[PDB]
Design a protein around this ligand. Sequence first.
Ligand code: BCL
Ligand code: BCL
Ligand code: BCL
Ligand code: BCL
Ligand SMILES: CC[C@H]1c2cc3[nH]c4c(c3C)C(=O)[C@H](C(=O)OC)c4c3nc(cc4[nH]c(cc(n2)[C@@H]1C)c(C(C)=O)c4C)[C@@H](C)[C@@H]3CCC(=O)OC/C=C(\C)CCC[C@H](C)CCC[C@H](C)CCCC(C)C
Lengths: 50, 50, 50, 50, 50, 50, 274, 45, 45, 45, 45, 57, 45, 45, 46, 45, 56, 258, 58, 22, 22
Amino acid sequence: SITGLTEAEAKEFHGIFITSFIVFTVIAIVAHLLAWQWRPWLPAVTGYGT
Amino acid sequence: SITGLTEAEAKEFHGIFITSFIVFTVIAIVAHLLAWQWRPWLPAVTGYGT
Amino acid sequence: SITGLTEAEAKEFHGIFITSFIVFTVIAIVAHLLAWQWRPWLPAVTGYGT
Amino acid sequence: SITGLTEAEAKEFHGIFITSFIVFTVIAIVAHLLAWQWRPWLPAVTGYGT
Amino acid sequence: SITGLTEAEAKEFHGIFITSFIVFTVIAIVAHLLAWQWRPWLPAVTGYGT
Amino acid sequence: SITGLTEAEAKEFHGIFITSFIVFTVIAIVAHLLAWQWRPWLPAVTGYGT
Amino acid sequence: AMLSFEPKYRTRGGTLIGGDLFDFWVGPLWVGFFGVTAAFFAILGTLLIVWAAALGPTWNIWRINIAPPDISYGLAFAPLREGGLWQLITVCACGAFVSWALRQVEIARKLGMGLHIPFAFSFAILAYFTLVVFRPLLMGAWGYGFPYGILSHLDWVSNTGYQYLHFHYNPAHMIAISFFFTNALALALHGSLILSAANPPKGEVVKGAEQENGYFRDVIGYSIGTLGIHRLGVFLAVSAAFWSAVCIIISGPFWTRGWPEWWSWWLNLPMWSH
Amino acid sequence: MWRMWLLFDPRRILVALGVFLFVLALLIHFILLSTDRFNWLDGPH
Amino acid sequence: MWRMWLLFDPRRILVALGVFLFVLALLIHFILLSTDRFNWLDGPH
Amino acid sequence: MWRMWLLFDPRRILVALGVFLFVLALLIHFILLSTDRFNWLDGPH
Amino acid sequence: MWRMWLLFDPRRILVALGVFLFVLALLIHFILLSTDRFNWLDGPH
Amino acid sequence: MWRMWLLFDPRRILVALGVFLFVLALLIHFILLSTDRFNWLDGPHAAQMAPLPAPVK
Amino acid sequence: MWRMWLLFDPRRILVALGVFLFVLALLIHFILLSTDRFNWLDGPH
Amino acid sequence: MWRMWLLFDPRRILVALGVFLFVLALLIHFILLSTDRFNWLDGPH
Amino acid sequence: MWRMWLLFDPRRILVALGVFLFVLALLIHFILLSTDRFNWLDGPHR
Amino acid sequence: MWRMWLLFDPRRILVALGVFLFVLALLIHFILLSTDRFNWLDGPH
Amino acid sequence: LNNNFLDPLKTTFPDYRRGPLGDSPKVWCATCHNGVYKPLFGKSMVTTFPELTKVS
Amino acid sequence: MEIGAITQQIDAAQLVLYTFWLFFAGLIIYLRMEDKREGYPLVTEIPGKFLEGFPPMPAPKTFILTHNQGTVTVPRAVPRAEIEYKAEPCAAWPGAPHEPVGPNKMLSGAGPSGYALRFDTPEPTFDTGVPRMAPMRVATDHVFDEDGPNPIGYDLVGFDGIVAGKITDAWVDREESLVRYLEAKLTNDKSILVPMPLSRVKDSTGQVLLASLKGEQVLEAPTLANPDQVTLREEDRIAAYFASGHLYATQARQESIL
Amino acid sequence: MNTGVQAALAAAAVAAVAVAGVVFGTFERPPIETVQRGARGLAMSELYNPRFLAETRA
Amino acid sequence: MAMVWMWILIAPAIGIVLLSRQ
Amino acid sequence: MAMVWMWILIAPAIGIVLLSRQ
Ligand code: BCL
Ligand code: BCL
Ligand code: BCL
Ligand code: BCL
Ligand SMILES: CC[C@H]1c2cc3[nH]c4c(c3C)C(=O)[C@H](C(=O)OC)c4c3nc(cc4[nH]c(cc(n2)[C@@H]1C)c(C(C)=O)c4C)[C@@H](C)[C@@H]3CCC(=O)OC/C=C(\C)CCC[C@H](C)CCC[C@H](C)CCCC(C)C
């Protein structure tokens, strides 16, 4: 191939790349859940109002 | 074909492209529905008025 | 031919080009109808006057 | 033929060019008729004077 | 092996890279634990309040 | 061996590198202990106040 | 249309993004992905400039003035009629300049050339980025950027210079000017020497490296050579832009007083201090 | 009018048209945002 | 009058005409928007 | 339209298309954040 | 979609993606720091 | 996962990560020093009594 | 004067004439707009 | 004087004459416009 | 003086003479316009 | 620790060490001289 | 201030209070302002000293 | 008191400015005409249609060359013949690129592997008709400077790490006294020239690194007609072959990398 | 290494250290307080170093 | 004045479509 | 709070040694 990776190596990287993307997204989701508890965003048009 | 893709590869890539666009647009449609609920746009010439 | 297209492919693309143009224009016409309903333009010389 | 077109092609392009020019002009004429109705130009020396 | 490491050397490097990252993270965690005791961050919406 | 040293020099240099690093750190620890005695850092949120 | 020797050189490839989709020529110009991007940013940026001019009080080309936001807006995106249009035009200009440089990289790769030309142009981009983003960022407000107007941006330069009351005493300003002046002197010398060798008196044979190197050894005792002069031309022009970027980045973020006062460090050296 | 495709390459027209349409749409949306009457986000002042 | 296209290249004419007409149309629309009388968005003030 | 991928490789347009979508979305998010009504962080003043 | 790695070097893809993610993360953190409500160092004033 | 070092050069990753981590750590320390609450050298603590010239927009 | 076209290329003259006439016409229109008396859009103030 | 064209190419002279005459005529028209008495658009002050 | 055309090219001389005479004529006309006495358009500048 | 000279050239070490120490000493002497308290020539004030 | 007050005090000032040319010390902008756009940032000290606001 | 006034609105400085504009317009016309002494008139997708653009092409000028190698008139009435490049167009419409053919694209003559048909004689020195570029075995008055690398005896290595040969001699410019080519003895006993601007002399490992070609592609590089001199045309052939490797050495180098 | 190169590198090294001494011994730094007083983009405003201003206010 | 927009936006679209069958 | 700096200095030092004796 142009890159030089075989079909097997290309599949292996893609499996790791995709599963690493999911891990990053999951950690981010938990980070946002924690961040929401500290300080919610998306206020009403009147404001947050405590 | 000048890309080196076979008939089966072209259909598979096309299927991936279509489902991604539908998923991306559907998520966008739900996001706009939530955004309108949070804060509507397109005011009257008077304004928004609470 | 300068483009190097035969008659069959020249006609085929024109058919796809026309229908894409028509759909794009029809969507724009509906958008303009909704835009005019939301906020008309082209005021009188004395202003929009309420 | 320096241009590279044949006599039949010159006849064909010229007819299509002229009808396209007429259509473009007729639309522009009506647009200017509507534009004059909305807001005339060429004021008098004193001014438009409402 | 686009770089030049054998399969075993890839195993060797990865093993001590993981623990070096772990030790670095563990030291950082205690540093953040101590820094929190000195001066906490992430205040309430009303402020730190002494 | 991209460095150019056999495995014999690697443990030789490492052993000397570590003990030199220990001496450098222990001296720095003593310096910081003396520095803390002269002028402590990390004030309380209300200041130093001697 | 193509030059007489051109057709053999129009090969496919050399692109960084996109590939064969945008790899074609329109007339003499090659497009590529960044040509599409450069065209988009250039056209949109120019159209926004005209729209900002339409909102202004004049159509005089010399008097059109598109100004940045107020300082009070800080780093926020201002409303379009109060400096927001300036910010959009700035973003378009940044996109257009970077795309132009990246397009040059692809063109040089298609011809098998070195990347010296886009490298040299990147220093011009750095100076612009210093003026409109880097210096405003350090000052904390987009209002520090210069207004977009042929004569109005000279007013910004003048007022900015007198905020330090004598801008000639800026030390990086002196170095940058020395590079600009030397580059013009070097350009005049280089252009003259090549033309003098290629265009001797009528009926005389064309002259080569022996006369070219011989000329400056006779007049000044040294010749830098053909490779050296083109190295010098890049180095002088690039350093003029680099030190220009330095001279303005230190004016306000790293110096808030009159520039002549800065030279008190030299006047107060203990070898001769009063 | 189907004869333009034998006078112009469809690919080069589409890329030209795509840039032209996107620029024009962006310009008009920005023009409306810079007016008081047709600002659909903050509305009139 | 059709031998003119045996003289002038139709492709170069159409591209130059297309650029010329779009730039001119943009310029005229922009000039009207700058005026108080012919501004159709915000209008007179 | 699967035939389109026999002419142009869909793998070579993803980064170009991904860049386009990101810049468009970044523009819209920044425009909304600048407005008083649609600022979702500090909210209306 | 694993065929993407038959055309593009994963070294270039990962470095470019990593730089993009880091710059994006820096931008969002700095934006929050500039707000009164979401500043976690000095807090609201 | 370990196979990545067959693809990435350990020489490049270690040097690049070392530069990245130090610059990031230097940035975070400087950010904290710039804050009143987290300045660990001088610590935390008159503008209305001695005002600057008023802005004129 | 028919012999004029035995001397100059008819294509180059017409292109040169077309550019000259448009620039002159554009010049005259602009001068008239700049004047108070002959401004046909806003009129005399 | 008929042998002036045995020295100078008529094409060279005609182009030079046309450019020279137009620039001179443009200069004179502009000079008159700058005067109070001979301004035919706005007239005397 | 007919021998000078055996020394100088008539085409170059006439071209140089034409440019010189016109630039000189332009200079004199503009000098007179700048004067109050010989300004034939408005007269004294005031 | 005597093995450090099998790794570094004593010529470059002694030259670098000598230059470093002298410039460091010059830096410290001048820093003290600029202070009022540690000025040993004219003294404080 | 310099012509009517400081200069006529030339003989009253001792010679070490005068310049190298023997002239009396004189006032300029920084004598009051001292590097600030207003002296003492505009804070007034004469409001409670009416005797310093009227010429005898 | 109005010094410099021509009319109530036109002043002297304004007139001098418009005088410069007329001169500058003429200068740009002159410069653009001088730009058209090479490659014009333009060729189109028509067998006999040529464009000269505006401004038109200038009158011919003649260069006299040294040592009886002739006279050169530019713009040429009949342009120089082009090489017989081997490429297949990627499309039929104007503006489309072409793809070089052959297993070794560096020999196709298309893209960066193209070159000009220059003089088929060596460039001579001005003082004597002696060839300007000569191997140091012939130009014995040139020796390598100390405190600088000496590449003689180094291995010639492609960017893939494959050794293609050993450096045997260096070719110097007798006019400027500098190295322009390194001569390498290849493993097939070929004795090719490599351009110095495309060679990285790593004196630490004793290697000359080629970033443009793989080791096996070096073995097909052009060879000199005779071993002691190189013509101007051969210099172009050698440069084109090595430089085209940056786009043609691997399929990856020709495709978009991101 | 060539003696002329060594002298050039030594001179460059001395200049760089000398420049570093002048730069770090004289320059100010952000943050800087700006008081705008003219129109947008006319660059009519006042600069104030907060550290210098704090000393001046004292 | 909806007529002004309706003509200029829609009529060129029809003109292109009706020219497309020539 | 001498301990706050104590760990951030000493622990990476003892971290390297304990890491280097595996
Ligand atoms: C505002 C409220 C909270 C907060 C709310 C959130 C929320 C919500 C999130 C974060 C997230 C992050 N925060 Mg935070 N965060 C706060 C304040 C901080 C402070 C601080 C000094 O106060 C720090 C150090 C951090 C640190 C971080 C990062 C660990 C993380 C950003 C991920 C990233 O940059 O990926 C970019 C870099 C990469 C992805 C690495 C590149 C990987 C590549 C693709 C693989 C190959 C790499 C190759 C070999 C090298 C090339 C690339 C190189 C980097 C050059 N936060 C405050 C206190 N923070 C995010 C997170 O948890 O993500 C996991 C997240 O969702
Ligand atoms: C604000 C409250 C506290 C404080 C809160 C914290 C917290 C919380 C943390 C720190 C951490 C650090 N602090 Mg602190 N810190 C404070 C004030 C200080 C002061 C001071 C003068 O007061 C000093 C000297 C330090 C010093 C340090 C460092 C020891 C450490 C950051 C390490 C680093 O940069 O890794 C970057 C460099 C590397 C990781 C080396 C890279 C190794 C590579 C992979 C191997 C090859 C190297 C390569 C080839 C070349 C690169 C070498 C160079 C890095 C360029 N702090 C104040 C008092 N500090 C962090 C820590 O403890 O980390 C363990 C941490 O979590
Ligand atoms: C001020 C009062 C009215 C108004 C008064 C008028 C008047 C009067 C006219 C218009 C006309 C137009 N108006 Mg209006 N118009 C108004 C406000 C608008 C607004 C808006 C956002 O408010 C929009 C989007 C428009 C849009 C338009 C266009 C539909 C049209 C210009 C045609 C053109 O540019 O062809 C340019 C493009 C071409 C000519 C391409 C044609 C094919 C070419 C020759 C060959 C291809 C070349 C090459 C391949 C491509 C190059 C060109 C490409 C198009 C880029 N108007 C206001 C409300 N408007 C004009 C019109 O309708 O003409 C028919 C016209 O006369
Ligand atoms: C101030 C009082 C009057 C006035 C006083 C006069 C007087 C007095 C005269 C004119 C003359 C002219 N006036 Mg008037 N004119 C006025 C206001 C105007 C206005 C206006 C908008 O108000 C316009 C458009 C004009 C226009 C004109 C021209 C029609 C005419 C000759 C100018 C010229 O360029 O010829 C020069 C150009 C040529 C002769 C073409 C050269 C032909 C060459 C030899 C062959 C082709 C060469 C080459 C291939 C192409 C040409 C080169 C390029 C075009 C550069 N006037 C006012 C109202 N005007 C003059 C005239 O009538 O002459 C017949 C004249 O004597
Ligand atoms: C670094 C050394 C010097 C340098 C070098 C340099 N410039 C270069 C290059 C190089 C090597 C190129 O290769 C490149 C080129 O191709 O030139 C022909 C270029 C170039 N240098 C240019 C200009 C330029 N360089 C300048 C300076 C310098 N260039 C440095 C002093 C200046 C100055 C001092 O003012 C100018 C004006 C261009 C002609 C060209 C790059 C053209 C380009 O960017 O193309 C893409 C963009 C457009 C075609 C239009 C973009 C329009 C914007 C979207 C809107 C306008 C924004 C702008 C902020 C408006 C401001 C107006 C007011 C200031 C009046």
